[model samples]
Target chain A: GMPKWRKTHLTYRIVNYTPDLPRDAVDSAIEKALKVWEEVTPLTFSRLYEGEADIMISFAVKEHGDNYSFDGPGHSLAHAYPPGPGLYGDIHFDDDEKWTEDASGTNLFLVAAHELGHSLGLFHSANTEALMYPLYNSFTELAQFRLSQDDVNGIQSLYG
Target chain B: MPKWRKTHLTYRIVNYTPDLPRDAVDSAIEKALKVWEEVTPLTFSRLYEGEADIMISFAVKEHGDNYSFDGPGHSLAHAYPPGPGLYGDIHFDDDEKWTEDASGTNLFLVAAHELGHSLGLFHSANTEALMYPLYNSLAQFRLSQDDVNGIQSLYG
Candidate 1:
């Protein structure tokens, strides 16, 4: 059976906002990042400014918790867990990354939107053109953003 | 690091593409599967009917799965890893002009790359892999040594 949220609606909270950007920006970035998927399927993302959340979000450098640790600003920009309990839906961003609001550096929206894919039920897709392809790509215009068929298929297969 | 929990894998071609001859798609996918099968203990069998573990299909733009493919000159194909439901399924973007040789986007190469993901191999670290994130016309068509090593890393 689908081990996703027994219910469609889900809640998330940024446990610790990265100092790289203001809290408002971090909140909006994560919001829009998640909304990208939310817009495409029956799934919904509700944010909590504090307290326990279904999908726990945070920022850290190197070791955070769990068995593996986040490597510095390198191949891995962030990581997340699929739908489940405990740390299942938690997401961690590498603090060493020079996060940014734009293409000046590691775009938080790009990375967060990807992590949210994992936070849902998706894994890294092989279609290189898809956003879920797990390679460093730029956002020429997030305003006209699109989810690749592979990316859309992955999500819709779960919650679509 | 990932692998199909079972060594005996069965695949089914749900349909065919008109770009190439009927057998062209068949043999290309066959050879692509062999790339990993030759290097690892994994074995794959083709199915003619019914739902198989790995269902392969060809389509363009909006298909039944709702993963809309672009017109032409876009993503070649994509595959899911070993798991439940649509997991291990592969879809080709019929929009691309696939050819047997290096004339247009090569079917064998794209199939080889996506099948890597179907078999649980992520995009390899760099260009030394058939699993590389980008697909290039092979200077010489063959799976890289690292590509062999990577699949066996899981199946071995």
Candidate 2:
């Protein structure tokens, strides 16, 4: 028999904020990112209008607190803590990066999707095609950023 | 509903020479490090083995023609491509700390695990445990020395 490794169950919260884009656009972008994992397996996300939430998804113009500061556009647009409590599922975007519904700017949906993976107890997938990989690029032209089988399996293993 | 984003992969490789430990032990140690990702969400593995078989465990003795240096022990070890394949390659910063357990130089367990990334696995989030992001001699003492669990988690 194989020994079972202990699994960690974590939660998240979305921080409401005004973005460069319309409010609906921000909500839509967030929802798009969340859908990547939702399609793959059974995972639920609760959105909070205010306060500290487990997985706080918010927008910021410059350096946000925490040891990991955002570098705006080029280097790292956003980052999240690995699955756990308090700030675990939080996702922060580099407001300096052009927020857009399309690929011209840092694709909000794509970055969100990647950040969401971190929120969902998943790490950057080694697979370049996977949404969890550390690197970022425009996905709007492609019009889609779906969760790879590996990503699905990873989150499912945890929540399912 | 809004659109979703795609995932991307990235990796780096470190090369080393064959010395001190037997090649098989070195290979097994590398495998053990990768096993840390088994239960987690990340996916990574070895991409190439200098002159050894892809499946069978192997090791290197010294920096030969196709190899390069990344730092000594402080950098400890390094790996190759991050995607799935026979790309996982590990190299020990032989110049730095090297130890048998928690007491001396770089702990064998710790180096072995870092070597695992050279094989394609990333650091685990388990802070209190072996795969925790940083190196810790005391934590290594409490963890298993085997690579079976780590390997199974990645390749399996």
Candidate 3:
């Protein structure tokens, strides 16, 4: 039997620069998003100025390189590659999505948390209330950036 | 604070009635397929007879529904549906390799499990090994009848 390995720790880099937001703001939002996972376990993220990380995080507005492209605004805001090694933990943001640190736009932190769930080897849960759920929505509060109990338990069960 | 109400689950049917496989096999497969979900915790089941589940399930034929569009030898099958419902369906690549063993695409095992989601179960993170997110017809694992029991436990 092939050993089923679970991804516990991951690294990422942001690409597909969003023109609407400054680089520093984007960095700050991404950092804030990674914090949600750190609070769950000992999981940590480091940015690779060069070389590929376990997860390659990037921002693209419309059509990107992959066969699947962002539809902009409404259809799909972003998606994450399933857990594997190289090029597997990739995260893409919808450029059409108003990338902002505020509630008025798609919360970078919220989307990051969701993408991080993928990087950590979790898939979309059927529970809509769960952070691992696929559809994107703004978190009512910063706390929504954190994983729900079910989400936490699922991930921990996989890696812990 | 405002209390949030959950969204209702609805399914969209993608009718791809093919002439190759016997209609009864497709129909039996579809019916028995729905039975798989009748046992789960979530509220889901087939919306219409002969209608596609949230995940589409069908046999492939030459130049048939989107199979040949992507070539045949490598991709054995594929499936996709919306989060809560709407377009939940699974499509088997009518071309390429398929086998009863781990060697080829196992139709019954794959359809039964994919139907798991056409009903509403997501990929389980638990490595019980029953729900390993990839297709392996040689899986040597069927619904375990336990899976069937679990799904039925939900709606029944």
Candidate 4:
């Protein structure tokens, strides 16, 4: 099903933090990643401390808890549930990866932005310049990155 | 026992009801968030991307979460405590006749009460406290000293 968050405005909460980076740095990475979508639509995100948020942001490794599990670091970075219920907007990062603030390591900001794209109810993109394109082949720069026109077209199409 | 780790937080409204003007819903939600702001140094910001700490929306029977609405009658609305998915978020039953004033279901009063939970406060035993689990058909709309003191005991 092409399930998406039934509404534009959604909530997200980072229930778990990784030991790979400082807490605030991780916070910054997450905030920056989420901003990737704000640039395209009327969508909004907020941070929560307790209770069930729409988009549950957390870290996991191997088989954290959900039926679907991460295959460690390199094989898969992370995954998310499409908008629907309980875990629909939830996101999990592969802690095995060297999640970082800058371009070094796994690049938490870039990866986070990509995974959040999934939670926003987008399918993986085939265009090489598209952020969803496999292998993370696009957007080498984090803070100054831009989605390709094709990618932007697909993004703004649904939520635009 | 329950408190947010930071002084500043964020929230958003995902949906609105026809019962009230869109701006009315927004104003009420903002005012609700402000209710606690007046009590503590804790700050709340509004965001537009990634994951929202609290995601607020409106839905009817089987809206995807465990809490399904009974469809117009008594139950007004609900909110999650500060945390994750559905947590810190609030929802209203679309079947109900929402309103800005006492004529129908009061968005301001209900929103203020629900926002209390979105920040981690539980139902207050003090009947007059806004955090009290029970909501009236209509009230004067105030966050009592009971709520103020209780909320301050945590954030400040």
Candidate 5:
């Protein structure tokens, strides 16, 4: 069986942010990304301003502590560890890519949703329509986003 | 217009990435190619030398082509549609940790997507299609009906 968090309530903290978007936008993106998952599963995510969190989110350039350094502009966008202790379930975005709240640049909300899927123990889906699909692409309806059935199925398997 | 003129095609892996074993790369490449083969009447064969219809390779920044890779995160790979010369080549960003599964960038998944391009398929509006331009880290993989329809339109 796939490894998953036993608890439903989880906490995340944004260790830092990318200069590409306003701090508020980044915060909104993270929060909204979590909502996508919360809408389906019983899982609930809360933000922590201090101390160790269940999920640590941050943006960094190449070689930012983790052995998995971010590639500059395009190629690898961001990565997250699966559920676990220390360094596990942490999400890191490549600051080199222009992070944004909308269709242009790398939409933080879309990527965050996918990364958070990993943090919540969801693997990538072969369903290209799925938000849990591995690759990042420009989505048209960012404001009215909904989780694909593949995405809903994955999260529900873990937290439902 | 980008569809291949023939049913049988050839591909040559110009070089291999050090991130995975040669056999692993071979298996990944073969498996990726099969994803398309299973759906359409097209068949693919690997070539060791000379000019093949599709050429595959792995490289870092500014590796001879016009599109330069940006280290490890944004774009995982790219490929061209069917035509002459470099029109059907696939490239993987060596900066990425190519893997067999969800741990790292899944080569089989990415390869399948790029191979779609090499076989003359463009990005699909349908998110379920393999021809979708975005990259994903998938565990188990399978082609969608949209993918089958897209290739069958070209090769069927």
Candidate 6:
């Protein structure tokens, strides 16, 4: 069995902002990222500002407190934990990358949605078209980005 | 954006960033500015006191220009095109850990891009160009044809 969240409702918090984009832009992208899951499952999500959230989101550089430190700019984009307690389900984006709301840079909406999938119970998909695919693809237009069938099957199997 | 009136320009480093050695900052700034100089008739020199044609500095949050640096990520740095007074200045977000290599945010790369703006070049559509709106890790730095074409249009 997968290590899935026991409850239907979840909460997330952004501990910091990246210098590459506006604070409101980061907030908006994160909200929309969570909505990708909320739209498909019985699960619902809320944002938190003061305490530990089911998902703790942050942008960090090399040797961040987590043992899984980031590798500079090009290689390691971001990492997440599967649902659980404490550090579990937290997401960290490598601040070294230029995070933006558009194709001009690494789109935050694309990466956040993908990372949130991992924070849930989803694993990397063999289907390259799947949003759960391990590699970050910047070609897809944000307006057209959606979960592939493989993604739906995977997420629904855990929380559908 | 107005172009600089002369081919020979001077720059002043308002202060050195804490993360890199003073020499590293000087060398990186020199290398970045040279990228522009090599392609066009423009030449750059360093200054010690008072305002140079371009004033470079590292600052965090509200730094008096009204364009406040958010933090270490997102907005790395920004610059102005050619003009007078604060017009040709470059400002880096001090919150980011500046580095000489890929181990952290490469100062050479960011400075090169900002210097492009400082030299009156705008962002390019070419993804491979140094003037591209977004930042990427370059295995090695070289001015793409797009970058050369744009700057040459201004100074050549």
In model 6, what is the error at residue B28, expressed in angstroms? 0.8
Each model's lDDT: 0.80, 0.53, 0.58, 0.74, 0.83, 0.85
Task: Give the higher-lDDT candidate: 2 or 4.
Answer: 4
| lDDT digits (tens) for residues B20-81 of candidate 3 | 34553355355535445344433444465544335454455553444443444334445543
Against the correct fold, how does model 1 do in TM-score? Answer: 0.53
lDDT tens digits, residue span A1-160, model 6: 2389998799989989998988998988988898888888999888889899999999997768765557556556888999999898999999978899988878899889889999997888878798888767888778876788988899999976
Question: lDDT tens digits, residues B1-156, model 5?
Answer: 588888889999999888889999999999998888888888999899999998999999888878999876777888988898988899999988887764567789889989988888878866567776665524567788888887888888
How does residue B77 of candidate 4 score in lDDT? 78
Give candidate 4's error at residue B111 in angstroms: 55
lDDT of 5 by residue, A125-158 (tens): 9887888876566846876788888887787777
TM-score of 5: 0.63
Lowest summed-lDDT stretch of 10 residues in model 1 chain B? B132-141
| Model 1 C-alpha lDDT per residue in residues A1-160, reported as the tens digit of each score | 2257677889998999789999899988888898888888888777787877879999986557654455445535888888887788889998878898888889999899998888787887888788888676874676677888888788888875
Full candidate order by lDDT, most accurate first: 6, 5, 1, 4, 3, 2
Q: What DockQ class does candidate 2 belong to?
A: incorrect
Model number with the top lDDT: 6
Residue A105 in model 4: lDDT = 82
Candidate 6, superposed: residue stretches over 4 Å from native: A1-160, B137-139
Candidate 1's DockQ is 0.02
The candidate with the higher TM-score, 2 or 5, is: 5
Model 1 Cα lDDT, one tens digit per residue, B23-106 = 999988898887778888888898898778889888888887756777654366788888877889999988766778655567
TM-score per candidate, chains pooled? 0.53, 0.46, 0.49, 0.49, 0.63, 0.56
* Backbone clashes in model 6: 9
| Model 5 CA deviation exceeding 4 Å by range | A1-10, A16-55, A60-92, A99-160, B59-77, B93-97, B102-104
Question: Which model, 3 or 5, shows the larger TM-score?
Answer: 5
Model 6: lDDT of residue B3? 89
| Quality class of the docking in candidate 4, CAPRI style | incorrect
